[PDB]
Amino acid sequence: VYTRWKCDRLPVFQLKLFTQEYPMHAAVGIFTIIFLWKHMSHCSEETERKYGWWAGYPYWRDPIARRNETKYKQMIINNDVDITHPKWTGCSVEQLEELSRVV
Amino acid sequence: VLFSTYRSSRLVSKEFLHGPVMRFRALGEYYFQRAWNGTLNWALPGEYRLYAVMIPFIYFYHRWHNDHTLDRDHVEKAMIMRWGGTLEDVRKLSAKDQLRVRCFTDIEKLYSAYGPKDTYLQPPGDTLPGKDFYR
Amino acid sequence: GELFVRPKLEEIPPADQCRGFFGPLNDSLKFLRLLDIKWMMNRAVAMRREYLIATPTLFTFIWMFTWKGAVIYFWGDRAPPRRMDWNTEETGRLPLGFKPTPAPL
Amino acid sequence: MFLFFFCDLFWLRLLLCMYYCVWSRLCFIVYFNCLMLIFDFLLFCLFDLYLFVGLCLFLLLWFMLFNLYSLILYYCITYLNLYLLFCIVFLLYIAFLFLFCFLCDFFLFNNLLVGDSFMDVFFIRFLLCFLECFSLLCRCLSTFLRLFCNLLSSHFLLLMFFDFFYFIFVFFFYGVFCYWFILFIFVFCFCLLFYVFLYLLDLFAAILQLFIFCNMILQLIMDFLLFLLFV
Amino acid sequence: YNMLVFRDPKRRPQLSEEERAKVVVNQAEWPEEFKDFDPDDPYKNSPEIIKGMSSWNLFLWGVECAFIYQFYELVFPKSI
Amino acid sequence: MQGSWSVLKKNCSNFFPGLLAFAQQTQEAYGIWLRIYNRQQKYGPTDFVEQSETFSPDYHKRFHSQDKNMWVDKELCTEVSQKEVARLMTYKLDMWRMAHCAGALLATGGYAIPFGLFWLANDTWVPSSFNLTGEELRAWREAQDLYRYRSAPSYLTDTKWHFDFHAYPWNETQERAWDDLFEKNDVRRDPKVVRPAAEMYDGFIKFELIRRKSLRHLCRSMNIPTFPMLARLCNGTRVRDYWNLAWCEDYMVITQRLHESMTDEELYDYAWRRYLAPYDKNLNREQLMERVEDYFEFLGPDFVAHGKAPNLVILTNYVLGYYNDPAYLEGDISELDKNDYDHLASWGKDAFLRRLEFENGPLRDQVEAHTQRLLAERAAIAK
Amino acid sequence: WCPEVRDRAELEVDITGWQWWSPLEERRLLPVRLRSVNEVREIMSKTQAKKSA
Amino acid sequence: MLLGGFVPRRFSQFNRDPCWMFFIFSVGFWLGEYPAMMIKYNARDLVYDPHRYVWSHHDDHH
Amino acid sequence: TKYELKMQYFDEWMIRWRKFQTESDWEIEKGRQWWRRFNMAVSGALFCGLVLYTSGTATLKRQYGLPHFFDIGVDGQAKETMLKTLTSRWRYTPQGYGRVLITGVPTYILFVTLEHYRERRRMQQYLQQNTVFGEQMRRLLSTGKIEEYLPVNIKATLPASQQAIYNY
Amino acid sequence: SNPADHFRPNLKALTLYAERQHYVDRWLHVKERWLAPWYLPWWSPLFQLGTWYSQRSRNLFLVENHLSYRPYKFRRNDEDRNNPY
Ligand SMILES: CCCCCCCCCCCCCCCCCC(=O)OC[C@H](COP(=O)([O-])OCC(O)COP(=O)([O-])OC[C@@H](COC(=O)CCCCCCCCCCCCCCCCC)OC(=O)CCCCCCCCCCCCCCCCC)OC(=O)CCCCCCCCCCCCCCCCC
Ligand SMILES: CCCCCCCCCCCCCCCCCC(=O)OC[C@H](COP(=O)([O-])OCC(O)COP(=O)([O-])OC[C@@H](COC(=O)CCCCCCCCCCCCCCCCC)OC(=O)CCCCCCCCCCCCCCCCC)OC(=O)CCCCCCCCCCCCCCCCC
Ligand SMILES: CCCCCCCCCCCCCCCCCC(=O)OC[C@H](COP(=O)([O-])OCC(O)COP(=O)([O-])OC[C@@H](COC(=O)CCCCCCCCCCCCCCCCC)OC(=O)CCCCCCCCCCCCCCCCC)OC(=O)CCCCCCCCCCCCCCCCC
Ligand SMILES: CCCCCCCCCCCCCCCCCC(=O)OC[C@H](COP(=O)([O-])OCC(O)COP(=O)([O-])OC[C@@H](COC(=O)CCCCCCCCCCCCCCCCC)OC(=O)CCCCCCCCCCCCCCCCC)OC(=O)CCCCCCCCCCCCCCCCC
Ligand SMILES: CCCCCCCCCCCCCCCCCC(=O)OC[C@H](COP(=O)([O-])OCC(O)COP(=O)([O-])OC[C@@H](COC(=O)CCCCCCCCCCCCCCCCC)OC(=O)CCCCCCCCCCCCCCCCC)OC(=O)CCCCCCCCCCCCCCCCC
Ligand SMILES: CCCCCCCCCCCCCCCCCC(=O)OC[C@H](COP(=O)([O-])OCC[N+](C)(C)C)OC(=O)CCCCCCCCCCCCCCCCC
Ligand SMILES: CCCCCCCC/C=C/CCCCCCCC(=O)OC[C@H](COP(=O)(O)OCCN)OC(=O)CCCCCCC/C=C/CCCCCCCC
Ligand SMILES: CCCCCCCCCCCCO[C@@H]1O[C@H](CO)[C@@H](O[C@H]2O[C@H](CO)[C@@H](O)[C@H](O)[C@H]2O)[C@H](O)[C@H]1O
């Protein structure tokens, strides 16, 4: 005789279980997952340094700095960003050259 | 039409890997399928030998993982911080020196909160290097 | 606990018997029944419509314990500071001599 | 931020696969009250009062695979976080509560207005109603907090006692060969007794706390169930 | 008897005293493993799994494994 | 029934002719339903016309009441014939399924097309109008019967288990009726013996208190689409309407004895719409007449006298009992001569197993006597 | 080889009937047993008397 | 649930069952690791790290 | 036309660059919010009306019959008037899926249509703006892409104390 | 402290970072790609489900006029109570 658990395959039984057996529970679970990923899915660098490492943050190599450096280099190279633009520096290119000659 | 929703739509023959599967079931059933193996909510069996075998194995593999993957990080951090603050500085030492340092770290771990506090508190007048030695 | 049976039409006491905060709001004071919350509560209890008192409360709690709680916590406006940083209404306008692109046509 | 990690049940999953490829009877259940809600015959309920059995059994199994085996040294309770337990209890409790509320039967809440007509509605009955509607959410919070903190405290105590035992055993066993061997023997016997007592206490409390974690949910369900009599 | 928390199961008697007294015991038919059977030590004559492997031998094997685990680095240290 | 490419081709070929036939049937059925609705509104009882409210005693949830919200139009034969009623019922089923499909299409825009391909590959949910030949109609009926077989046992078991676990019959006659109600279709059930179960279940659960899961099972067994199920009062309304039409037709037939003059195929269809005669059984006219007369007898004299049918839940269980085939058993008895645990033979017996065999084997009495004597001697020595 | 028991158990579990005890049905069916010859004689005499009446 | 199974009467019987053989081996490991720690961590030649005051976990977590 | 797909990028950019939100854009958004509330109110009124019209005769009699909670006299008069108005003529009182469809589909259609046309209106308003947001909207509709950092590229107006960055 | 450190997951393998802007934009692109085709009318329930709630939330954000300051969600340092920047 027909029974959901014995005859249906696992994905079908899962859908039936969470749609016609525990639908409210599934709905609340999805709600909670969305909330968690919307408000509890960020970690600042200081937080990672304080608690994000098993034995502590190895300041002697600063892996966060290398990670950010790789990120920014990849972004600049791929997107063809002119980091010498006045908006990034706040001064004209000629002023930048003058400063370079000064320092 | 593309995929069947019924488990009866077999994908292999009934005799596929019959021998190995039977051996696996023989291993599973010999000790578990017994009257005195009455589980408590499927988690706690009634067979004493199951406890006797599994508890040591679980402890062994957990301890191996902890010693070779988890505590190693703390040990390496101590070695790096106490002997230059860089990995190359530690590697400048010999294997025997590293052994000495790691065994001192184990001493500290065993002492913990009941051991003498001179292992990390420098008594006044001590001639050994301070915290600003490498600074 | 036990099954609830709605009272019959004849088992419901008259409105005039209900009491308010101070006293019954009988003739010459009927229109005050709308404003007296305690009179309405007593009337609901007399008419066995107690849910009117309980349903709004519990739901409210739920609404606070589920959706408005976190909304207030994460996006609510805290107390304003003493020295307030008002907006000068100078930002946004296009600069002089700028040629904006034409609108769709 | 996305962290990739794994639960500490892989060996237990393997054992479950090995030992439960064939059927076996279950007769001992930590929380048996989820199967027998009605004790007086001829009483029946039109509400799905047996919906909690599957979740109860799965939760018992999961929490037993985690907590009971956590006594073994270095075993990790991967789910041990306050807010994660809050999420679990929120799911279960609020799901059942919304099941009752979606029924759209307001009379079901009549019992919230505690007391009788003879008590002041605004100043007595209504205040108590507010307090009880608060008590429901407090019951949810209490369930999750109790489950979290019992485990945390028990394991803290076990770790501290084990550290003390290791310290004295390693750095003071030589006293066996000395003239003060009797003191060390007394201390060692005391430590063994305490070790056994702590293990037994933790084993019993781990199962009792699951009894109570499931009992709170079943009590929530029972607080809104109405039974009809067969005629 | 008990071994820590493990208790040896005991079979409940099924025969009454009157019927029991009429039973004739013939140990000649019993297996060699179970002769002079004692409920307090039913496995006294049980054969060893490995001939010549005593319980103390296994205990010493475990002790030696622990000693190796603790002392191997003392003889063959390795660099970080 | 599982989807197939042949059925997919069949339905694709007949898609547009099927839609045209469905539209024509829609016009005809709208006319018939307009006549029936006008008659009900004009001559119906005040409670039925005003839709009197019946609330459950526990949670005060409204649902259709069999006595008040269902009415049998004894004089419907003047305006509407039996064949028209059967046509209306068949069109109601087809329109329900088509409405669900159209709602899905509207909801999901053009993304329902692959799901439409899945739909056309199976005859379970396609309208009867999609079959343009006898063989196609036979296959479609086979699919419907397969769905009924799949669904009915669950409904029957739900009802029986809930009642038997939460209540018991009052008297011996009710016990016999309850026991014989849920027998497999291989045996014939006497409606007179089984009727008191209707009153018993009315005492336990009426149609106004039917649970949503049981309603879903019943709708599955009646080939009524269930997704989206929604509130229990929608599919409940569908079931009420279908059974009200069926009861009107049954009263007409009983009064006019139409079934005797009804032809073989029409009689078989009439039984099928009552969930009494599966097509795969290849029943003859004698068996169909026997089952129809049993159904009429189960309805009882009170049905003709006052238009009051027995409890709808028990009636549905009784009719669907014909789809509760005996549990399958295939394989020669000689297969029982094999052994199931040969793979364990190589393992042998450990010390504990040997001890258990020794203590509980043929020598169990001797071992017990020896052990008891030894224990008694030791106890005496201790004292 | 006992299909009825299998099907009934599977269906009961699949419809949320987890419980494995049926005290009411057992109470109804517990005292059932085949009758003795004398009981059969008494029942046949009762039936004959009823038919004669 | 602790219902049944082989139960050695004394130490000498732990060799009558493979599972209990593994159990006694594990017990030997457990109990023998302690004397090893006593010998290793109370040795005469063991010396505290000269730089132990350079850094410690106490300052790190503080 | 599907304005939401175009407008989502613009809204996200405005949120990221909300500093350059002129009071005109703020008023536009407030008007959008007010119109959303109005659409909700009218849709709810329509849904309530459809529900009342299709309600069963017995249901209406129970709802708009005795007893009176307040018993002021106006309440009873209004309830009797509404009951007579509803029960005078014949009303189609379906149940189940039919009532669901009749009560919902009109409401859903009305709400969606109003909101879509208000979104189109807001798009037009932003197009007609002479601020940086309006220029960004026009550029988005022209090139099909959102140009981030536009305000600093074209040097949009800044407070007198924050023009140093533009000093180049 | 040391006892407290024993209550951490013991099988951490990898950590991946992603800015909210980037993956939000990617999700918006995916949603636009799947909701663009002509065979999905704007009045369909699916399209409204996809778009209306997001539009409402973004509009609520834009209309926001708070007298207090809300520090940037993704600052480098948010552990300092006396430095919102
Ligand atoms: C374009 C905008 C789209 C918006 C989004 C829509 C999204 C999809 C949602 C579904 C929409 C409907 C889909 C089409 C259904 C077919 C028509 C129909 O009702 O068939 C009758 C039939 C009624 O079922 P029933 O149980 O027999 O009814 C019991 C009543 O007692 C029955 O009463 P009775 O017993 O007295 O018998 C009466 C019977 C007597 O008649 C007959 O017997 C003759 C036959 C008549 C029906 C024929 C139906 C044919 C269906 C197939 C059509 C062809 C498909 C072809 C497909 C292939 C094409 C290539 O006649 C009726 O059935 C009449 C029913 C009442 C009318 C319902 C329609 C209301 C909406 C239309 C008006 C809209 C106005 C907008 C104004 C705007 C102002 C601003 O419909 C159904 O089967 C029910 C629908 C099943 C799917 C439900 C899915 C969930 C719906 C939730 C909606 C919630 C609100 C909306 C928001 C959603 C947000 C999530
Ligand atoms: C042109 C045509 C004419 C015009 C159009 C006309 C209208 C047509 C439309 C209407 C048609 C209606 C009738 C439909 C009937 C057929 C339904 C059906 O599906 O039957 C099962 C059907 C077979 O039917 P059958 O064989 O005839 O058996 C029928 C029996 O009677 C068995 O019957 P049963 O009852 O046992 O089956 C029922 C079963 C039906 O389900 C199934 O059977 C499952 C089907 C999927 C199984 C998938 C298994 C394989 C998974 C593979 C995974 C990937 C593998 C690796 C791939 C690598 C590729 C490189 O269960 C259910 O019904 C469960 C329903 C669940 C509802 C969920 C509702 C969620 C709501 C959310 C909560 C909302 C709460 C409120 C919130 C409010 C907030 C405000 O299943 C299939 O054919 C399976 C297809 C699998 C396809 C391949 C895998 C998926 C591929 C995905 C590609 C994605 C591409 C894009 C990716 C983009 C990435 C960025
Ligand atoms: C080991 C791992 C394996 C893999 C696992 C995968 C991961 C799974 C994890 C999570 C699993 C659990 C999730 C649970 C969620 C919560 C469910 C819940 O609360 O349900 C309560 C409740 C339970 O349902 P029920 O009515 O009590 O009965 C459910 C039983 O299953 C009814 O059973 P029954 O036996 O009574 O009926 C059987 C039969 C009876 O036959 C019939 O009923 C006749 C045929 C009916 C056809 C459908 C009619 C629909 C009419 C309109 C419905 C309203 C539309 C509203 C407007 C549209 C909103 C989108 O019905 C059917 O065969 C149904 C066929 C449905 C096939 C589709 C199932 C989903 C497969 C995946 C396709 C979509 C993939 C999207 C993602 C990928 C994109 C690339 O749900 C409802 O009330 C149903 C509301 C449905 C609204 C529409 C769907 C909204 C969700 C979003 C849709 C997005 C579409 C995207 C299209 C593509 C875009 C690119
Ligand atoms: C059956 C259910 C069973 C299961 C229940 C399960 C749940 C458990 C219960 C507890 C809840 C748990 C919470 C779970 C999470 C749920 C989601 C959530 O919390 O989201 C909140 C969240 C709140 O928004 P937010 O973002 O957090 O922040 C607020 C913002 O302002 C947002 O901005 P916005 O633009 O979205 O604005 C939304 C607006 C709400 O909606 C609006 O946009 C505007 C209002 C729409 C009105 C709808 C129609 C009203 C009825 C019309 C008439 C009908 C009868 C017709 C016949 C009449 C004949 C005369 O809300 C407001 O901000 C308040 C507006 C206040 C306007 C009135 C101003 C006051 C003066 C005028 C009234 C006083 C007059 C007396 C004067 C003195 C006389 C002496 O989202 C919403 O729910 C709002 C959006 C959706 C609104 C839908 C509007 C339709 C409502 C129809 C309800 C009808 C049934 C109720 C009564 C039933 C009686 C039997
Ligand atoms: C992608 C799409 C997204 C869609 C989202 C929208 C939601 C989903 C849409 C619909 C989904 C499909 C399924 C819906 C459920 C179907 C239920 C069902 O099967 O009913 C059968 C049932 C048919 O059975 P029947 O036998 O004919 O009659 C039922 C019996 O009476 C039954 O007899 P009974 O004995 O059970 O009698 C009791 C019955 C009596 O009720 C009825 O059955 C009558 C019909 C309902 C009346 C509702 C209105 C009551 C009066 C409201 C007054 C409000 C005044 C406010 C004034 C404010 C002034 C400032 O029930 C009640 O007593 C319940 C009363 C309602 C209580 C509401 C409590 C809400 C608490 C809110 C907490 C706080 C929220 C957050 C904070 C908000 C504020 C800041 O259907 C109906 O009667 C009506 C069904 C209506 C379906 C919903 C239509 C949806 C339209 C949507 C338009 C807007 C679309 C927006 C789209 C946005 C972009 C995507
Ligand atoms: C070191 C600091 C420690 C602090 C610890 C603080 C405690 C943290 C505890 C976390 C674990 C426990 C979590 C329990 C669950 C909490 C749930 C919660 O509060 O989340 C609320 C939050 C609130 O959402 P929100 O934050 O996006 O709110 C938006 C509000 N505005 C726009 C005004 C800012 O919900 C979610 O996160 C999920 C939202 C999506 C799912 C719901 C969609 C439907 C909404 C329906 C109503 C509105 C639309 C109209 C109707 C429908 C139309 C289709
Ligand atoms: C539906 C495809 C339409 C277009 C034609 C594409 C043909 C591509 C060539 C395929 C050659 C190999 C075919 C091997 C047999 C496949 C059998 C099959 O599909 O069975 C599904 C079977 C599971 O079946 P059950 O659910 O257990 O039960 C089935 C009974 N209802 O699935 C599998 O095991 C996977 C088999 C994968 C085979 C390869 C399929 C490739 C399909 C590609 C489609 C895209 C177009 C390809 C064009 C190629 C042009 C040269
Ligand atoms: C089916 C219904 C179809 C309706 C079609 C249009 C009907 C005719 C126009 C209705 C009135 C519109 O007039 C409307 O007035 C309100 C003020 O009261 C304005 O609203 C303005 O002031 C209110 C005051 O609270 C602010 O909240 C709002 O942000 C602001 O925009 C609207 O911007 C304007 O559009």
Between β-strands D228-229 and D43-44, what pairing exists: parallel, antiparallel or unpaired?
antiparallel
Which ligand is closest in space to the CA of residue I40?
4
> Among candidates F160, J55, J24, which has minimal Cα distance to I2?
J55
Cα gap E59→H32, rounded to integer Å: 9
Chains F and D make contact, 3+ CB pairs within 8 Å = yes
Cα gap F311→I23, rounded to integer Å: 69
CB F118 within 8 A of CB J45: no
Atom of ligand 3 nearest to the CA of J34: 100
Task: Please tell me the total number of residues recorded for chain H in this structure.
Answer: 62
Helix (H, G, I), strand (E, B) or coil at F59: coil
Burial (CB count within 10 angstroms: exposed 0-12, middle 13-18, buried 19+), residue D146: middle
DSSP β-bridge partners for residue B44: B40
CB D122 within 8 A of CB C37: yes
Atom of ligand 8 nearest to the CA of I31: 31
Cα gap D189→D192, rounded to integer Å: 5
Q: Which of residues 43-102 of D touch B (CB under 8 A)?
A: 57, 60-61, 64-65, 68-69, 72-75
CA atoms within 13 A on the CB side of F142: 13
DSSP β-bridge partners for residue J14: D4
Positive or negative: CA dihedral D202, D205, D209, D210? positive
Burial (CB count within 10 angstroms: exposed 0-12, middle 13-18, buried 19+), residue H52: buried
Neighbouring chains of H at 3+ CB pairs under 8 Å are: B, D, E, F, J
- Residue E56 Cα, ligand 2 centroid: separation in angstroms? 63
Q: Which of residues 29-48 of E touch F (CB under 8 A)?
A: 29-31, 33-34, 37-39, 42-43, 46
Atom of ligand 1 nearest to the CA of I108: 97
Would you give the DSSP letter of residue E13?
P
Q: State the CB neighbour count (10 A cutoff) for residue B95.
A: 13
Nearest chain D residue to H36 by CA: give it: D170
- Residue C72 Cα, ligand 7 centroid: separation in angstroms? 54
Neighbouring chains of E at 3+ CB pairs under 8 Å are: B, F, H
What is the distance of C-alpha I54 from the center of its chain?
A: 26
Atom of ligand 6 nearest to the CA of J57: 32
Token pair for residue C91? Answer: 């930002």
On chain F, the residues whose CB falls within 8 A of the CB of C4 are 60
Between β-strands D2-5 and J12-16, what pairing exists: parallel, antiparallel or unpaired?
antiparallel
CB F127 within 8 A of CB F291: no
DSSP β-bridge partners for residue E6: E3
Burial (CB count within 10 angstroms: exposed 0-12, middle 13-18, buried 19+), residue F57: middle
Between β-strands D228-229 and E6-7, what pairing exists: parallel, antiparallel or unpaired?
unpaired
Contact D48 G16 (CB under 8 A): yes
Cα gap B19→B24, rounded to integer Å: 9
Which ligand is closest in space to the CA of residue I32?
8
Each residue of B60-85: b (16+ CB within 10 Å) or e? eebeeebeeebbeebbbbbbbbbbbb
Relative orientation angle of helices F82-108 and F15-43, to the nearest 10 degrees: 120
What single-letter amino acid sits at I82?
A: M
- The DSSP H or E segment spanning F271 is helix F264-273
Cα gap I98→I120, rounded to integer Å: 33
CB A19 within 8 A of CB J50: no
CB H23 within 8 A of CB B53: yes
Contact F150 A20 (CB under 8 A): no
Token pair for residue A6? Answer: 């014995």
> Among candidates H5, E13, J2, J33, which has minimal Cα distance to I8?
J33
Ligand 7 contacts CB of residue B3 (under 6 A) = yes
Which residue among A35, A36, A41, A50 is best mutated to probe the pocket of ligand 6, counting the most ligand atoms within 8 A of its Cβ? A35
Q: Where do runs of H (alpha helix) occur along E1-80?
A: 17-21, 55-75
Cα gap B68→B59, rounded to integer Å: 14
Contact B53 H19 (CB under 8 A): yes
CA D202 to chain B, closest CA, distance in angstroms equals 15
On chain A, the residues whose CB falls within 8 A of the CB of B70 are 54
Which residue among I40, I60, I83 is best mutated to probe the pocket of ligand 4, counting the most ligand atoms within 8 A of its Cβ? I40
Token pair for residue A78? Answer: 């791929």
Contact A6 G10 (CB under 8 A): yes
Contact F50 I96 (CB under 8 A): no
On chain A, the residues whose CB falls within 8 A of the CB of B86 are 60
Q: Could you give phi then psi for residue F67, rounded to 5 degrees? A: -75, -45
- The DSSP H or E segment spanning J61 is helix J45-63
Contact D110 C50 (CB under 8 A): yes
CA atoms within 13 A on the CB side of F267: 19
Task: Provide CB contacts within 8 A for C27, sequence distance 6+.
Answer: C16
Strands (DSSP E) along J4-84, which ranges?
A: 12-16
Q: Where do runs of H (alpha helix) occur along chain C?
A: 37-46, 51-63, 69-75
Nearest-by-Cβ selection for F358 from E20, E26, E31: E31
DSSP β-bridge partners for residue C39: none
Contact J58 I8 (CB under 8 A): yes
- The DSSP H or E segment spanning D5 is strand D2-5
Each residue of F336-354: b (16+ CB within 10 Å) or e? eeeeeeebbeeeeebbbeb
Burial (CB count within 10 angstroms: exposed 0-12, middle 13-18, buried 19+), residue D204: exposed
Atom of ligand 7 nearest to the CA of B9: 27
Ligand 4 contacts CB of residue I99 (under 6 A) = no
Experimental method: cryo-EM
First to last CA, chain B: 74
CA distance to C54, D110, F278, F353, per residue, from I68 (Å): 20, 20, 57, 81
**For ligand 5, which residues put their CB under 6 angstroms from it?**
C 59, 63; D 104; F 55, 61-62, 230-231, 233-234; I 43, 48, 51, 95-96, 99-100, 103-104, 107-108, 111; J 45, 48-49, 52
Cα gap I96→F237, rounded to integer Å: 6
CA H38 to chain D, closest CA, distance in angstroms equals 5
On chain D, the residues whose CB falls within 8 A of the CB of G24 are 41
Ligand 4 contacts CB of residue I44 (under 6 A) = yes
Would you give the DSSP letter of residue E6?
E
Q: Which of residues 312-371 of F touch H (CB under 8 A)?
A: 350-352
- The DSSP H or E segment spanning B70 is none
Would you give the DSSP letter of residue C15?
G
CA atoms within 13 A on the CB side of F235: 25
